[PDB]
């Protein structure tokens with residue numbers, strides 16, 4: 001088996017240039033917004049989150065940290081001990097984990 | 100390992116832990132050797148004293 | 150002698166043992182490799198003094 | 212490999228910790244001793260075969 | 262002059278052997294003989310004259326007497342090695358003076374330096390490839406044979422031909438150009454915010 005063998009799952013286009021072998025383009029490559037346009041877009045989100053998204057945050061941060069535990073019995077123990085006796089299914093709806 | 104790990108493979112755990120010592124005087128030795136190589140280049144080709 | 154290896158641990162409690170030998174405050178500003186630099190660099194400094202030996206014979210210094 | 216110039220035999224003890232239990236100052240004590248016995252081997256051979 | 266004997270002894274080494282102090286051991290020249298010089302036969306005649314004067318031209322005395330080696334040539338290879346280590350460039354300069362009286366052109370000198378440095382450059386890359394094979398071996402791939410000149414069904418890369426055509430299109434990978442991404446420095450934002458929260 002050739003040592004420099006690769007199986008690629010996306011289309012690539014190889015340049016037909018002498019002395020060189022490389023991928024010159026990707027088919028149907030769409031260029032998105034620039035780094036500056038993404039920066040202005042992200043700042044609008046972070047500004048709203050700074051101004052109007054900081055009230056009642058400590059409760060949500062405690063619920064999020066409890067759901068990063070390994071077992072479910074430890075999550076319930078975390079909610080009862082740290083989050084003021086919150087319910088498992090009720091806190092999962094707040095965090096958006098419920099279908 | 101069961102949730103976030105790979106296959107348990109058997110390897111040989113090397114106890115000897117090599118590490119290149121980052122020294123100061125080793126570059127002085129290197130410059131001296133290159134200073135001799137460059138001086139020989141000047142001694143043979145750019146010496147007009149004879 | 151096996152009990153002599155644990156002498157500094159008996160006068161301490163577990164919290165004092167951890168705070169003493171385990172929880173060493175992080176300080177990554179020291180020049181740890183100075184030990185190797187002084188030792189190995191001493192070969193070069195020793196050669197500076199050794200190359201000036203008043204030995205008369207050239208082949209004795211060889 | 213300690214006597215080779217720019218060795219590429221990286222798997223022949225080049226990247227391993229190799230200490231010994233012989234006399235130190237190797238090229239001053241041990242290596243001349245191996246050469247002294249070499250001279251005896253050939254001088255004894257020359258005397259016998261001749 | 263005043264400081265001549267002190268300085269001359271300090272600058273150069275003299276011979277310490279007294280090999281020629283013993284009279285009968287002195288060589289007539291038959292130990293190290295020049296074989297190809299145009300006056301070769303004049304050298305042999307002088308050796309024969311030296312042997313005849315020692316025996317008053319009764320060479321039977323030489324046949325019965327003991328023959329000695331040239332004691333003056335003892336340890337001569339070691340003595341040159343020590344001078345080469347003492348002053349390597351001074352030894353090379355004087356040993357090549359007569360050869361360097363004939364200076365080749367700038368082209369020939371450039372070809373010597375170019376091919377010599379080019380050969381050392383390929384040797385350095387060959388050493389670095391051996392470290393790649395050792396890392397491949399430790400990574401779990403046993404290696405039969407050695408080198409990168411693949412006998413089988415594989416692509417080879419011979420190495421940059423040391424001519425300006427390929428040296429303009431290609432250049433070797435500079436390892437110092439492979440860097441940590443600068444986004445690492447954005448983690449320091451965590452430090453500035455923590456310092457303000459703690460009132461530092």
Ligand SMILES: CCCCCCCCCCCCCCCCCC(=O)OC[C@H](COP(=O)([O-])OCC(O)COP(=O)([O-])OC[C@@H](COC(=O)CCCCCCCCCCCCCCCCC)OC(=O)CCCCCCCCCCCCCCCCC)OC(=O)CCCCCCCCCCCCCCCCC
Pocket residue numbers: 187188189190191192194195198
């Ligand atoms: C006022 C007049 C005088 C009155 C007083 C007279 C009495 C004087 C003596 C008491 C005062 C001494 C002051 C210092 C206290 C030290 C005491 C001590 O016990 O040290 C033992 C000392 C260290 O013991 P050690 O642990 O065995 O270490 C040596 C090992 O070999 C090490 O081997 P290693 O493998 O373990 O490690 C490798 C080593 C590398 O070591 C080597 O490779 C050398 C190995 C030797 C050669 C190898 C062949 C071995 C030969 C074997 C036979 C030798 C036998 C000799 C026995 C002599 C006994 C004394 O590298 C290093 O470890 C680090 C080296 C670099 C560290 C920095 C060193 C700084 C030194 C001081 C700098 C300032 C001085 C000024 C500079 C000099 C003047 C221009 O042994 C020595 O004697 C070292 C001798 C080195 C040469 C010294 C020459 C200079 C002497 C200075 C004199 C004053 C200045 C001149 C004044 C001129 C007008 C008068």
Ligand SMILES: CCCCCCCCCCCCCCCCCC(=O)OC[C@H](COP(=O)([O-])OCC(O)COP(=O)([O-])OC[C@@H](COC(=O)CCCCCCCCCCCCCCCCC)OC(=O)CCCCCCCCCCCCCCCCC)OC(=O)CCCCCCCCCCCCCCCCC
Pocket residue numbers: 233234235236239240
């Ligand atoms: C008011 C007083 C003020 C002063 C107070 C203090 C006075 C001085 C007290 C000294 C205190 C002790 C000093 C400690 C500092 C040591 C620092 C150091 O660098 O040691 C490194 C050195 C190496 O040890 P190491 O590196 O640490 O390795 C650890 C183990 O050794 C490793 O074990 P290994 O088995 O693996 O090693 C193998 C072993 C190898 O096996 C051996 O041990 C070799 C032994 C064979 C030699 C034994 C015979 C030597 C004597 C021959 C001359 C005899 C003359 C009289 C004959 C009388 C006949 C009945 O070791 C070696 O490999 C040795 C190689 C290194 C040296 C070889 C070359 C040396 C240079 C030779 C030429 C010197 C030219 C002289 C120029 C003068 C200026 C430098 O340590 C020593 O060698 C200790 C030597 C102690 C002195 C020996 C006596 C020398 C006598 C010379 C006589 C000619 C001059 C007479 C002058 C008279 C003046 C009054």
Ligand SMILES: CCCCCCCCCCCCCCCCCC(=O)OC[C@H](COP(=O)([O-])OCC(O)COP(=O)([O-])OC[C@@H](COC(=O)CCCCCCCCCCCCCCCCC)OC(=O)CCCCCCCCCCCCCCCCC)OC(=O)CCCCCCCCCCCCCCCCC
Pocket residue numbers: 243244245246247248249250251253334335336337338339340
């Ligand atoms: C029961 C318990 C005890 C058991 C003991 C058992 C052993 C018995 C002990 C005694 C054995 C010998 C018996 C007595 C022999 C006496 C003969 C005699 O009258 O003197 C002749 C001979 C005459 O020499 P010469 O006439 O003055 O000058 C030589 C010619 O002019 C030529 O000078 P050249 O300038 O033209 O240079 C060419 C020269 C040499 O030039 C070379 O190219 C040789 C280069 C060698 C050094 C380089 C080695 C390479 C690796 C290191 C690299 C160095 C790098 C340095 C540079 C740095 C990098 C750039 O060519 C030679 O090879 C001369 C060697 C002597 C001739 C013999 C026939 C040689 C053919 C065999 C060649 C293979 C062996 C070579 C070994 C060379 C050692 C000197 O003198 C000697 O051989 C002296 C040897 C006596 C030393 C005694 C030491 C104490 C004895 C006890 C030691 C304890 C050892 C324990 C061993 C333990 C077991 C492992």
Ligand SMILES: CCCCCCCCCCCCCCCCCC(=O)OC[C@H](COP(=O)([O-])OCC(O)COP(=O)([O-])OC[C@@H](COC(=O)CCCCCCCCCCCCCCCCC)OC(=O)CCCCCCCCCCCCCCCCC)OC(=O)CCCCCCCCCCCCCCCCC
Pocket residue numbers: 135136137139140143144350360361363364365366369370372373374376377380
């Ligand atoms: C080598 C034989 C096989 C080996 C077996 C061993 C044989 C036993 C003998 C070996 C012992 C002696 C070795 C040969 C020495 C040369 C003979 C000699 O001494 O004659 C006196 C000779 C005087 O020449 P001349 O015939 O009396 O008059 C010439 C006239 O000037 C003008 O004359 P022209 O107008 O009629 O023509 C111009 C030019 C004649 O044109 C040429 O010579 C063409 C030279 C073009 C470049 C050749 C590059 C050689 C390849 C080296 C690259 C690495 C090798 C591996 C890669 C390539 C693989 C093939 O003149 C010459 O250069 C005369 C030299 C011609 C014969 C020597 C050529 C040797 C080349 C090597 C052949 C292939 C070896 C393959 C390697 C094998 C390794 C396994 O001394 C010289 O000056 C010429 C030697 C070259 C000096 C060039 C300037 C070098 C300056 C370097 C400065 C930078 C150094 C910095 C210092 C270093 C740090 C401290």
Ligand SMILES: CCCCCCCCCCCCCCCCCC(=O)OC[C@H](COP(=O)([O-])OCC(O)COP(=O)([O-])OC[C@@H](COC(=O)CCCCCCCCCCCCCCCCC)OC(=O)CCCCCCCCCCCCCCCCC)OC(=O)CCCCCCCCCCCCCCCCC
Pocket residue numbers: 144145365366367368370371425
């Ligand atoms: C106002 C007038 C103009 C201004 C005048 C002012 C000029 C001041 C002159 C002062 C001289 C320089 C003083 C210091 C030099 C001393 C050291 C030395 O190198 O002497 C060599 C010395 C003298 O050599 P030589 O055997 O007596 O031969 C002398 C002449 O070649 C003669 O012997 P030949 O007749 O047998 O030569 C025949 C010639 C026959 O040539 C031809 O017939 C036609 C040549 C056409 C050339 C075609 C060019 C093609 C270009 C294609 C480029 C493609 C790639 C480009 C890629 C770039 C990026 C895209 O072909 C050659 O072999 C020429 C030799 C190589 C020449 C290299 C430079 C060529 C261009 C010169 C630029 C100056 C233009 C001035 C305007 C002139 C207009 C009239 O010999 C030595 O090698 C010993 C020194 C060791 C040197 C080895 C290492 C050299 C590197 C360090 C050298 C020093 C630093 C660099 C200085 C400049 C060197 C290039």
Ligand SMILES: CCCCCCCC/C=C/CCCCCCCC(=O)OC[C@H](COP(=O)(O)OCCN)OC(=O)CCCCCCC/C=C/CCCCCCCC
Pocket residue numbers: 178179180181183
């Ligand atoms: C006349 C003065 C000339 C001085 C030289 C001129 C050049 C000046 C340019 C210097 C720019 C300074 C940039 C910063 C350099 C950093 C130096 C350094 O890293 O030292 C580290 C480190 C400090 O150790 P730590 O406590 O573990 O680290 C604490 C870190 N806060 O220093 C050392 O390792 C000690 C070695 C210092 C250099 C070697 C000193 C010896 C030099 C030999 C000459 C001395 C002769 C006399 C010695 C007496 C011996 C008996």
